[PDB]
Amino acid sequence: SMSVKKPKRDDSKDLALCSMILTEMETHEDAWPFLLPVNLKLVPGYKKVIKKPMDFSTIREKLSSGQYPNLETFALDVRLVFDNCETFNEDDSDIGRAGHNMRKYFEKKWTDTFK
């Protein structure tokens, strides 16, 4: 509350560390469904169904241009990529499986880097 603060957690490396995680996600072999925005003209249903599209290139551009106020807003966009993927793709599909693998990979890096 006013003039009463918890001790200051060092957040000065967050930007660099999120960038590194994102690099590692970008270069994973199952990243291909997530590298670029879904083409809303060529994928029937996507526009109407997926209210907030998100992809690694869009995250990268937001990260690079100071559009994440903190590391939690960065994690929310990454998770949004996987949550969108689960909404639109059957679990038993190459893309569905890619999404599950990537979410697992992300959450481990996230925990190991920050928790």
Helix (H) or strand (E) holding 9: none
* Beta strand extents in 8-105 (DSSP E only): none
- 102 CB-contact burial (10 Å; exposed 0-12 / middle 13-18 / buried 19+): buried
Q: Which residues contact 100 (CB under 8 A, 6 or more apart)?
A: 82, 86, 91
Q: What is the CATH number of the domain that holds 56?
A: 1.20.920.10
Find tokens 């993927």 and name the residue: 85
Token pair listed for 100: 């599950």
- Locate 114 and state its tokens: 């920050």
Q: Residue 100: give the domain boundaries.
A: 1-115
Q: What is the resolution of this structure in A?
A: 1.8
Q: Rounded distance, CA 35 to CA 3, Å?
A: 44
CA distance 21 to 45: 31
**Biggest alpha carbon–alpha carbon distance for the chain:** 54
Chain centroid to CA 66: 16
* Contact (CB, 8 A) for 25 and 105: yes
CA-closest candidate to residue 40, choices 31, 29, 51, 30: 51
Experimental method: X-ray
In eight-state DSSP terms, residue 22 is: H
Q: Do 61 and 68 form a contact (C-beta atoms < 8 A)?
A: no
What is the domain count for the chain?
Answer: 1
Amino acid, res. 103: R
